Amino acid sequence: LPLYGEGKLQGPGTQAIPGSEPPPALDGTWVGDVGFDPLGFSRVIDMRWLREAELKHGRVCMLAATGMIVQDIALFPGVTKTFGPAKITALHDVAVKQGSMQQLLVWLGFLEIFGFVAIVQMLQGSGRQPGDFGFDPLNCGANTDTLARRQLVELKNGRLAMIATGGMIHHFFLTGKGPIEFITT
Amino acid sequence: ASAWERFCSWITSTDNRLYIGWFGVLMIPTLLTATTVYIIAFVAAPPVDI
Amino acid sequence: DRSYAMPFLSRPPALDGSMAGDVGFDPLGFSNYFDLKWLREAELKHGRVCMLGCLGFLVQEQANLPLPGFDNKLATEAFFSVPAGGLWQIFFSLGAIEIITNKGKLTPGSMFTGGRAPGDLDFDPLNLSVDETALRRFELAELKHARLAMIGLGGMLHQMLLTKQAPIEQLTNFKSL
Amino acid sequence: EGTGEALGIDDTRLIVPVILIPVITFILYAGFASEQDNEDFFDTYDQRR
Amino acid sequence: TAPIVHFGSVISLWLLFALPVWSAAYKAAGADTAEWVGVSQVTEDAPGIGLYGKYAPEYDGPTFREGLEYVLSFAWKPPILIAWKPRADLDRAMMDPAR
Amino acid sequence: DFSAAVPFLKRPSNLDGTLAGDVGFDPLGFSDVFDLRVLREAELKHGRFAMLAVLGFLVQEVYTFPFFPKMAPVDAHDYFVTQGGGSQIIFWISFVEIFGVVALFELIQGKRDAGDFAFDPLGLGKDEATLARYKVAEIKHARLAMIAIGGFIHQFWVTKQTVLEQLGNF
Amino acid sequence: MFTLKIVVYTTVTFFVSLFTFGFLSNDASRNPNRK
Ligand code: KC2
Ligand SMILES: CC1=C(C#C/C(C)=C/C=C/C(C)=C/C=C/C=C(C)/C=C/C=C(\C)C#CC2=C(C)C[C@@H](O)CC2(C)C)C(C)(C)C[C@H](O)C1
Ligand SMILES: CC1=C(C#C/C(C)=C/C=C/C(C)=C/C=C/C=C(C)/C=C/C=C(\C)C#CC2=C(C)C[C@@H](O)CC2(C)C)C(C)(C)C[C@H](O)C1
Numbered sequence: 001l002p003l004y005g006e007g008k009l010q011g012p013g014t015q016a017i018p019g020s021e022p023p024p025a026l027d028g029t030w031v032g033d034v035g036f037d038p039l040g041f042s043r044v045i046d047m048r049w050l051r052e053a054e055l056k057h058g059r060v061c062m063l064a065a066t067g068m069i070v071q072d073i074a075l076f077p078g079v080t081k082t083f084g085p086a087k088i089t090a091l092h093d094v095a096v097k098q099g100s101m102q103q104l105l106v107w108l109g110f111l112e113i114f115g116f117v118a119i120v121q122m123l124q125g126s127g128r129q130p131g132d133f134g135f136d137p138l139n140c141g142a143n144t145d146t147l148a149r150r151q152l153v154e155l156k157n158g159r160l161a162m163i164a165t166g167g168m169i170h171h172f173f174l175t176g177k178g179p180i181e182f183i184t185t
Numbered sequence: 186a187s188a189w190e191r192f193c194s195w196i197t198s199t200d201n202r203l204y205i206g207w208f209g210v211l212m213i214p215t216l217l218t219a220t221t222v223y224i225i226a227f228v229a230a231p232p233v234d235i
Numbered sequence: 236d237r238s239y240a241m242p243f244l245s246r247p248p249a250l251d252g253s254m255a256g257d258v259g260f261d262p263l264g265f266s267n268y269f270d271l272k273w274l275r276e277a278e279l280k281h282g283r284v285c286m287l288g289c290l291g292f293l294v295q296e297q298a299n300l301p302l303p304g305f306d307n308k309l310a311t312e313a314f315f316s317v318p319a320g321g322l323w324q325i326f327f328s329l330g331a332i333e334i335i336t337n338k339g340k341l342t343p344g345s346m347f348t349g350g351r352a353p354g355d356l357d358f359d360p361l362n363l364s365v366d367e368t369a370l371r372r373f374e375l376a377e378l379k380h381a382r383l384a385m386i387g388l389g390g391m392l393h394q395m396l397l398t399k400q401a402p403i404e405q406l407t408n409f410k411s412l
Numbered sequence: 413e414g415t416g417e418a419l420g421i422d423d424t425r426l427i428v429p430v431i432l433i434p435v436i437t438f439i440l441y442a443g444f445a446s447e448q449d450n451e452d453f454f455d456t457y458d459q460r461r
Numbered sequence: 462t463a464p465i466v467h468f469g470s471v472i473s474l475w476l477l478f479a480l481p482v483w484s485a486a487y488k489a490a491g492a493d494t495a496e497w498v499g500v501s502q503v504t505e506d507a508p509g510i511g512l513y514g515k516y517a518p519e520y521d522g523p524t525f526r527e528g529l530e531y532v533l534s535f536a537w538k539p540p541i542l543i544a545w546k547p548r549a550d551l552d553r554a555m556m557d558p559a560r
Numbered sequence: 561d562f563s564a565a566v567p568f569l570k571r572p573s574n575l576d577g578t579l580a581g582d583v584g585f586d587p588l589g590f591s592d593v594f595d596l597r598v599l600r601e602a603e604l605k606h607g608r609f610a611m612l613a614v615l616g617f618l619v620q621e622v623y624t625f626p627f628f629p630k631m632a633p634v635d636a637h638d639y640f641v642t643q644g645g646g647s648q649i650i651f652w653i654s655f656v657e658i659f660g661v662v663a664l665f666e667l668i669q670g671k672r673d674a675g676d677f678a679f680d681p682l683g684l685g686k687d688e689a690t691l692a693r694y695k696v697a698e699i700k701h702a703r704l705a706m707i708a709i710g711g712f713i714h715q716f717w718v719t720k721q722t723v724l725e726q727l728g729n730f
Numbered sequence: 731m732f733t734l735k736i737v738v739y740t741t742v743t744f745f746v747s748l749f750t751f752g753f754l755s756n757d758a759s760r761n762p763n764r765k
């Protein structure tokens with residue numbers, strides 16, 4: 001798994017925190033490794049679980065950010081009748097009573113049972129890498145060098161989407177406005 | 186070499202001044218209760234509507 | 236020569252790697268003064284009770300036999316609703332198995348005379364542990380869940396007593412104070 | 413009195429001692445019993461303790 | 462001769478046949494695959510992991526009665542106040558008069 | 561020969577000078593009568609209590625938690641001895657102090673250093689040199705906070721003015 | 731009244747259980763002619 005940009009991004013000789021050195025778990029092989037782990041979470045918890053959690057959070061939060069934006073730009077027909085005008089976290093409470101969120105929980109949990117099995121199997125030497133669920137129907141990750149880059153994009157956009165979703169939700173708590181309405185203020 | 190075995194040996198011991206044994210386990214408390222209540226009721230007890 | 240769980244304290248001499256739950260934590264040092272086989276058996280037995288007890292708190296609380304005195308969610312107050320008759324015939328069922336599993340040997344001076352390892356009543360229908368590594372990881376998992384479920388039934392029960400609300404209900408209502 | 417309760421047990425509390433104290437005594441007796449040679453014998457009584 | 466007793470009777474025979482059936486299903490197959498192993502997130506270098514799998518530690522220490530007397534000793538003679546007994550090496554028995 | 565802190569007095573014998581913040585100050589001479597390690601542990605524990613108390617005294621005055629009512633620090637003890645929390649805090653302190661007793665028994669046999677509990681959760685003073693400087697800083701700040709907590713509380717009693725208030729208006 | 735009842739039940743059960751499991755503990759062997 002050669003690292004794209006090894007030397008400028010995600011590789012040795014690029015250590016983020018200049019004064020401090022990184023934990024011994026943070027080797028030069030992992031993706032998006034800028035040598036950043038001040039609180040030292042890596043020595044305690046296995047890196048495979050940690051990258052699984054990072055990729056799961058990033059993939060969930062990219063969907064969450066794009067949902068919070070698209071829900072403002074457009075809405076599926078009929079949601080405005082059942083759900084009244086209802087933004088990020090109020091819509092959660094309304095949709096829980098509606099029962100849609102139960103279905104989301106049921107089916108995402110059904111998928112996460114096999115996600116749990118995959119995490120277990122990787123942690124007992126199945127050879128699977130973190131976040132690799134074999135999902136590439138369009139065959140866009142076939143080329144290896146493009147896959148390398150797309151991995152760091154996935155990590156970095158996941159991080160950016162995590163911070164973004166935190167922003168949108170707490171801006172909603174402040175003003176009670178969505179992303180599009182909040183930016184035009 | 187077990188606590189119950191030692192207890193049974195002590196109860197069935199021929200070395201106690203007064204033998205207890207398993208029948209004594211039932212006799213001594215019952216007889217002592219009867220003696221105590223009889224003494225207390227004989228020295229002091231209100232009249233009884235026989 | 237210092238306990239891992241209690242850095243400040245020195246390691247209990249008895250506590251050791253061989254046990255499978257050892258992290259050096261015996262600050263009192265009971266180990267020094269009781270059969271550690273007996274202590275481990277007691278730990279695993281209490282935990283095996285509590286592991287079922289917490290789920291019971293939870294399942295009884297949501298589903299229940301449709302029998303007439305069997306339906307009362309607050310478990311604390313449920314023990315008495317179902318008749319002691321039933322609770323006694325179950326207590327007697329656990330007695331049978333106590334003596335069945337322990338094979339009559341059920342005192343500290345007799346329990347392990349047959350060579351039975353502590354905490355094993357020879358039960359292993361599934362999740363086989365013939366793999367020592369698997370046995371080694373599963374025993375730590377069992378001990379951690381035993382220890383956690385102890386805290387659990389404790390909280391669930393004392394808490395159900397505190398607010399007369401079963402587990403799931405209490406927190407959702409979470410009437411505080 | 414004269415009500416017909418089984419073993420006089422009118423309160424359910426009374427059962428806790430009545431069932432448990434034999435069980436603790438049974439547990440203490442089991443340590444004795446498990447230590448004995450429990451094979452059969454052809455005699456009027458067992459001379460092995 | 463009731464419909465529900467028949468139902469309970471089928472389930473009783475199910476519970477009775479479960480152990481002879483599934484215990485043997487376990488016996489023949491089992492999890493002796495040499496890959497069935499529990500997996501956890503924390504690094505296994507320091508999980509307080511069990512060593513030697515089942516471990517039974519031979520025991521020849523104080524009797525159970527003596528043990529409960531030790532535990533009774535927590536209230537009868539705890540180790541608290543002994544810290545404030547005088548300096549036990551020599552108390553400066555040769556404390557120089559100047560000091 | 562003679563303590564630098566008290567030049568007219570002679571240097572207390574057991575106070576050789578190894579422990580942090582040791583300036584040979586023991587006029588009454590408790591070190592000669594008792595183990596210095598036990599006294600050092602008592603000093604560190606009381607001083608840590610006092611440092612937390614001194615910080616909390618001011619943090620309560622500037623900010624009392626919204627779920628709790630607003631009372632000056634001293635007026636609070638009496639409130640929470642009934643609210644319930646008082647019990648919870650003193651309960652947990654006793655829980656930790658039982659293992660403190662175990663650690664003291666270790667200390668008596670010399671298996672543990674005085675005032676040491678391996679608490680560097682974030683590896684602050686992991687440098688040998690720094691741990692020294694920190695040990696000196698810890699003992700001084702503790703010795704100061706012992707005075708500060710007593711002043712704060714005793715001032716409230718003589719003058720109903722949370723320190724911040726009093727300082728504002730004498 | 732109930733407290734006295736349960737205390738008496740405790741005492742009676744204790745002594746009856748001692749009698750029961752004591753005579754059940756191979757009492758026939760406790761004779762001077764054994765072995
Ligand atoms: C796993 C444990 C367990 C076992 C192995 C077991 C076996 C048997 C057998 C087998 C030989 C018989 C024949 C039998 C019979 C009865 N059982 Mg029992 N039973 C167990 C558990 C419970 C529970 C939880 C309850 C219960 C009850 C009753 C009643 C009610 C009589 C009444 O009250 O009219 C009767 C007649 C209920 C009760 O007594 O209360 C309503 C009750 O709640 N049982 N039970
Ligand atoms: C053994 C074995 C087998 C098996 C098996 C089986 C059936 C195993 C079953 C195991 C079970 C049921 C385990 C349950 C554990 C529960 C825990 C740790 C709960 C913790 C709760 C906590 C900390 C809490 C809390 C709370 C409290 C107190 C307050 C509340 O307000 C909130 C909250 C609710 C959060 C098989 C058959 C495969 C065969 C094999 O050969 C051997
Ligand atoms: C001269 C001399 C010597 C000496 C000496 C000296 C000067 C000794 C001085 C010792 C002193 C000043 C000790 C002070 C201890 C204070 C503590 C433990 C405070 C705890 C506070 C708590 C728990 C609290 C609280 C609270 C807070 C904060 C928030 C409130 O809402 C609630 C509440 C009120 C409960 C030496 C050493 C040489 C010996 C020599 O021979 C003679």
Ligand SMILES: CC1=C(C#C/C(C)=C/C=C/C(C)=C/C=C/C=C(C)/C=C/C=C(C)/C=C/C2=C(C)CCCC2(C)C)C(C)(C)C[C@H](O)C1
Nearest residue numbers: 061064088089090092093162163164165166167169170173
């Ligand atoms: C739906 C719902 C609810 C809800 C809710 C939810 C889901 C709430 C919360 C959501 C999320 C996504 C929170 C994210 C918070 C992120 C933070 C604070 C980022 C910090 C960044 C830092 C420190 C930056 C660090 C740094 C960066 C990047 C750059 C510089 C270096 C460094 C310092 C390392 C409720 C609770 C209202 C209930 C309701 O009934 C239902």
Ligand SMILES: CC1=C(C#C/C(C)=C/C=C/C(C)=C/C=C/C=C(C)/C=C/C=C(C)/C=C/C2=C(C)CCCC2(C)C)C(C)(C)C[C@H](O)C1
Nearest residue numbers: 585610613633634635637638706707708709710711713714
């Ligand atoms: C009563 C009570 C409570 C309480 C309480 C509490 C928390 C009480 C706390 C009291 C404290 C901590 C008092 C401290 C006094 C310190 C003194 C006198 C130091 C003098 C040092 C000097 C002169 C140093 C001298 C010096 C020396 C030696 C060396 C250097 C030179 C020099 C500086 C000159 C409540 C609030 C909980 C309510 C409850 O209902 C009951």
Ligand SMILES: CC1=CCCC(C)(C)[C@H]1/C=C/C(C)=C/C=C/C(C)=C/C=C/C=C(C)/C=C/C=C(C)/C=C/C1=C(C)CCCC1(C)C
Nearest residue numbers: 285310311312313314385386387388389390392393396655
């Ligand atoms: C009363 C009642 C009601 C209804 C049924 C019935 C009548 C039979 C009766 C039954 C009562 C029963 C079953 C009671 C059982 C009591 C139980 C399970 C109590 C549990 C108590 C548990 C407690 C404290 C746990 C506290 C643990 C603590 C701090 C641990 C601290 C810690 C330790 C030890 C090491 C690591 C650090 C950490 C985590 C801080």
